[PDB]
Amino acid sequence: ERIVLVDNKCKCARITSRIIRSSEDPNEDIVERNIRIIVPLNNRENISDPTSPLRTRFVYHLSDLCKETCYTYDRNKCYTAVVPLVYGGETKMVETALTPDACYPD
Amino acid sequence: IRVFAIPPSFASIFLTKSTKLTCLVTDLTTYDSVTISWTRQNGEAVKTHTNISESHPNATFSAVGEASICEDDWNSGERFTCTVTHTDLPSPLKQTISRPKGVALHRPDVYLLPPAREQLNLRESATITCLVTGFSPADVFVQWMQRGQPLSPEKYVTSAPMPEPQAPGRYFAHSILTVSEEEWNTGETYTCVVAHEALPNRVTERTVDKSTGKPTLYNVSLVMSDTAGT
Amino acid sequence: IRVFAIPPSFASIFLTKSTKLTCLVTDLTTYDSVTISWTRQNGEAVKTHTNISESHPNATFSAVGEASICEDDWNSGERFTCTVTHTDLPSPLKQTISRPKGVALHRPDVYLLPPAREQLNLRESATITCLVTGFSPADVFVQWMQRGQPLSPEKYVTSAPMPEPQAPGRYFAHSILTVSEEEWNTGETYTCVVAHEALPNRVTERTVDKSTGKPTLYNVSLVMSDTA
Amino acid sequence: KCPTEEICKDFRNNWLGSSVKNFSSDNKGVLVPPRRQSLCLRITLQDFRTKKKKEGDFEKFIYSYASSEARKLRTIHNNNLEKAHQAIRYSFADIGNIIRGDDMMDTPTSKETITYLEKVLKIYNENNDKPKDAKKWWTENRHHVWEAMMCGYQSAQKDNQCTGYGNIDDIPQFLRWFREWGTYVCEESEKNMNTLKAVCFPENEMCSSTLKKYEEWYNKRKTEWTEQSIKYNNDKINYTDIKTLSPSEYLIEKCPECKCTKKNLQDVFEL
Ligand SMILES: *[C@@H]1O[C@H](CO)[C@@H](O[C@@H]2O[C@H](CO)[C@@H](O)[C@H](O)[C@H]2NC(C)=O)[C@H](O)[C@H]1NC(C)=O
Ligand SMILES: *[C@@H]1O[C@H](CO)[C@@H](O)[C@H](O)[C@H]1NC(C)=O
Ligand SMILES: *[C@@H]1O[C@H](CO)[C@@H](O)[C@H](O)[C@H]1NC(C)=O
Ligand SMILES: *[C@@H]1O[C@H](CO)[C@@H](O)[C@H](O)[C@H]1NC(C)=O
Incomplete structure (x- = not known):
């Protein structure tokens, strides 16, 4: 029986807990808080704006996410950044999708 | 005539x-x-x-x-x-x-290939190519940039699309970007923007630099604070 | 006639x-x-x-x-x-x-680029490109071998040479060999043979492997604190 | 005929672009299903070397991968039981063909697992009198793989229903892939034609949107249909039972679960 305390989707923290049960006796059960953080290793300060360089710092405040920028992309919401595309002398300002198969129109 | x-x-x-x-x-x-x-x-x-x-x-x-x-x-x-x-x-x-009529609509598999380490070792220049594969129809248009402003058309060359040998229904195209080695040193964000019918938002973007495409080292700083929580 | x-x-x-x-x-x-x-x-x-x-x-x-x-x-x-x-x-x-006779004679620079990481993450195929640049006669031949054995001509496709924008005299061409993703994970070595007139030995071979673009250094630093 | 409990304890959607052995010499126009593309069966030299030290590790490894593939298929096709069961049947026959070495995939696993099984049976069954070749090993042990992978299926959601293989492995891999493609195409065609008859044959923007979607889907599936049809035409003279039938009527008649009729398949593809 694993209970999920909090879960920040775009940070991918997944703070969970479970009470392991030993033989019946005066209480010696080990309470544990189990987290599973997926570091990107390739994302930027903005995951949407390509101009920002690679981010080395990886900040994970547990209390801040239990209750802004983050590292992991989401599969539900869209990340759209404005991008310039030029054909000839003039230019047209167009949208783009940073990641594929995430929130394509249906 | x-x-x-x-x-x-x-x-x-x-x-x-x-x-x-x-x-x-x-x-x-x-x-x-x-x-x-x-x-x-x-x-x-x-x-x-x-x-x-x-x-x-x-x-x-x-x-x-x-x-x-x-x-x-x-x-x-x-x-x-x-x-x-x-x-x-x-x-x-x-x-x-x-x-x-008779051409399919296959979603392109846009990938960005970093320049080889030998080309960087030659210290003369570096070539950045974009792997745009599996798109239908054969028509395609790709433009390169550097930190946001567009690059000159004479800097990047687009190759003629060819049918894919593995899948005859899809097509592949290549486009290299010749950049100087000192540009790759302390590398700026080089982007591959391509437009096609089969894209969801009709435009996709891939970004490479020194520390992303085949990096020599993974410099990361990982800090955790307040492990006790609330 | x-x-x-x-x-x-x-x-x-x-x-x-x-x-x-x-x-x-x-x-x-x-x-x-x-x-x-x-x-x-x-x-x-x-x-x-x-x-x-x-x-x-x-x-x-x-x-x-x-x-x-x-x-x-x-x-x-x-x-x-x-x-x-x-x-x-x-x-x-x-x-x-x-x-x-009279044309420029510049040897090509063969670069065997590794496959993209995202394509390997998709676990569908592994296309290794052979970027050949810098040849003036624009008469290049690309052939692939695996473990010293040439592959079938239909597995790899070679594009026709086209002029380089920066160097008008020099020409460039590209070719891709498509194999399975776990075939790439197996550890097989693929050799790209580039035949040209200007080369001292008329050919040039480059070898690609899993360990050609791997991260040589990992700088993970696990820091955990109980204070704000 | 659900398996016993103790053995149970012991054990994109892009058809094109896949790798096929000798695509131009033979098998011209065959399409690998996404389920086969995402099959949970990867055999490497390291795994074979680690599983050849002790007797029984390689077969149990094969059963474990079959169980994992069954669990993945059941978690994917959770909505419909018939589609999940047919996916299980198709994956079982696929892994059986891979074991027998008849797989047309260009992956090293398909061309190497037969050699691994030959070596394992040779180094361990010198005097055991059990068959040492892959074909007879699959023939005698086809039930064990079925029971193990049914155990793997049952662990996903505790499903009481059980099904037998029912003469699926002896069908060639092309014919099974063709049947799977026909089932998917016929189901999607029934859905699309029902929607089109509902919205356009009793507003204009909805009719235009659904017409564009239908034209795109038809343009993809017509190229797929032509590729599979020419492959079938190159590979139908070997078997006399399927030599005299067109692909559409073969899907309509000899395939019970295809649910393909004249209007669903032939009137829209063969015209
Ligand atoms: C990097 O992150 C900053 C975070 O503030 C972003 O700047 C703004 O982000 C909001 C969020 O959608 C946009 O609506 C604004 O238009 C952004 N500002 C500008 C000037 O574009 C942005 O993602 C990045 N910063 C910049 C300067 O581009
Ligand atoms: C921590 O260990 C327990 C076993 O006591 C396990 O159930 C749990 O999944 C582990 N946590 C994570 C994040 O894997
Ligand atoms: C690597 O990371 C450390 C710590 O974040 C930093 O001090 C150093 O400057 C970084 N070096 C490079 C080359 O980015
Ligand atoms: C690795 O990280 C440390 C700090 O964590 C930094 O001092 C060092 O320079 C980094 N290594 C390289 C090669 O930059």
Whole structure:
């Protein structure tokens, strides 16, 4: 029986807990808080704006996410950044999708 | 008198929002009596050309045309022929070009390949190519940038699309970007922006630099604070 | 009378390992008593000819006339001249074959780029590109081998050479070999062979493997604190 | 015939672009299903070397991968039981063909697991009198793989229903892939034609949108249909039972679960 305390989707923290049960006796059960953080290793300060360089710092405040920028992309919401595309002398300002198969129109 | 007609690519369909159809005619002498009236699949001509080109290095003349057709009509798939009536032609000639029904819509698999380590070791220059594969139809348009502003067209070259040997239904294309080695040192964000019909938002982007595409080292700083929580 | 005598390409020279000169007649009615021959310097005349077809849907006489002659003869400027003696023209149709001497000779720079990480993450295929840049004659041949054994020609596709934007004299070309993703994970070594005139050994081989672009250093630093 | 409990304890959607052995020499136009593309069966030299030290590790490894593939298939096709069961059947026959070495995939696993099984049976069954070749090993032990992978299926959601293989492995891999493609195409065609008859054959923007979607789907599936049809035409003279039938009528008649009729398949593809 694993209970999920909090879960920040775009940070991918997944703070969970479970009470392991030993033989019946005066209480010696080990309470544990189990987290599973997926570091990107390739994302930027903005995951949407390509101009920002690679981010080395990886900040994970547990209390801040239990209750802004983050590292992991989401599969539900869209990340759209404005991008310039030029054909000839003039230019047209167009949208783009940073990641594929995430929130394509249906 | 030989006429060459270039079909309008989807980049002109989307960016310009007006499909201009032209058919440059080489090996034609300067007479300046050109009236190109584009015709539909029926016998009714729709529009005439707006501007033409006269100057040529080889003292020749090109009878380029122009017409404005609604995008839905162009996507429908009727036959568009530029009916040239120039006095230089001994006899009228018809060139038949239209949107070919029978081409699939496969989502392109856009990937960015970092330059090889040997090319960086040569210290002369680096080439950045974009792996755009598995797209249908064959038409494609890709543009490179650097930190946001567009690069010159003379800096990047686009190769002609070819059918994929593994899957005949899809096509692949390549486009390299020649950059200096000192540009790769303390590398700026080089982007591969390509437009195609099968994309969800019609434009996708891939970004590479020194520390992302085949990095030598993974410099990461991982801090956790307040492990007790609340 | 379209006697289009296109010289064989360098890729054709190192493909069949034989130099076959071409002198083919196009758009002409098939006749007889056609004594084709090759005349070179010093009056040498050695020839073997095959592939004669009387009937054609386009009513064009084949007259292929392919003869095996050593590469050093071409390297010596022997000016191989075709001498098709057709009936309509009593004089033989002279069509010389020689290398266009005077062109620039720049050796290609072969770079075997590794496959993209996202494509391998998709776990569908593994396309390894062979970027060949910087050759002036624009006569390049690309062939792939695995463990020293050449692959089938349909697994790899090579694009036609096109001029480089920065270097007008030099040309560049690319080719991709598509294999399975777990085939790439197996650890097989793929060799890209690039054949060109300007190379000192006329060929150049580069080897790609799993350990060619791996991160040489990992700088993970696990820092955990109980204070804000 | 659900398996016993103790053995149970012991044990995109892009058809094109996949790798096929000798695509131009033979098998011209065959399409690998996404389920086969995402098959949970990867055999490497390291795994074979680690599983050849002790008797029984390689077969149990194969059963473990079959169970994992069954669990993945059941978690994917959770909505419909028939589609999940047919996916299980197709994956079982696929792994059986891979074991027998008849797989047309260009992956090293398909061309190497037969050699691994030959070596394992040779180094361990010298005097055991059990068959040492892959074909007879699959013939005698086809039930064990079925029971193990049914155990793997049952662990996903505790499903009581059980099904037998029912003569699926002896069908060639092309014919099974063709049947799977036909089932998917017929189901999607029934859905699309029902929607089109509902919205356009009793507003204009909805009709135009559904017409564009139908044209795109038809343009993809017509190329797929032509590729599979020419492949079938090159590979139908070997078997006399399927030599005299067109692909569409073969899908309609000899395939019970395809649910393909004249209007669903032939009237829209063969015209
Ligand atoms: C990097 O992150 C900053 C975070 O503030 C972003 O700046 C703004 O982000 C919001 C979020 O959608 C946009 O609506 C604004 O238009 C952004 N500002 C500007 C000036 O574009 C942005 O993602 C990045 N910063 C910049 C300067 O681009
Ligand atoms: C921590 O260990 C327990 C076993 O006591 C396990 O159930 C749990 O999944 C582990 N946590 C994580 C994040 O894997
Ligand atoms: C690597 O990371 C450390 C710590 O974040 C930093 O001090 C150092 O400057 C970084 N070096 C490079 C080359 O990015
Ligand atoms: C690795 O990280 C440390 C700090 O965590 C930094 O001092 C060092 O420079 C980094 N290594 C390199 C090669 O930059």
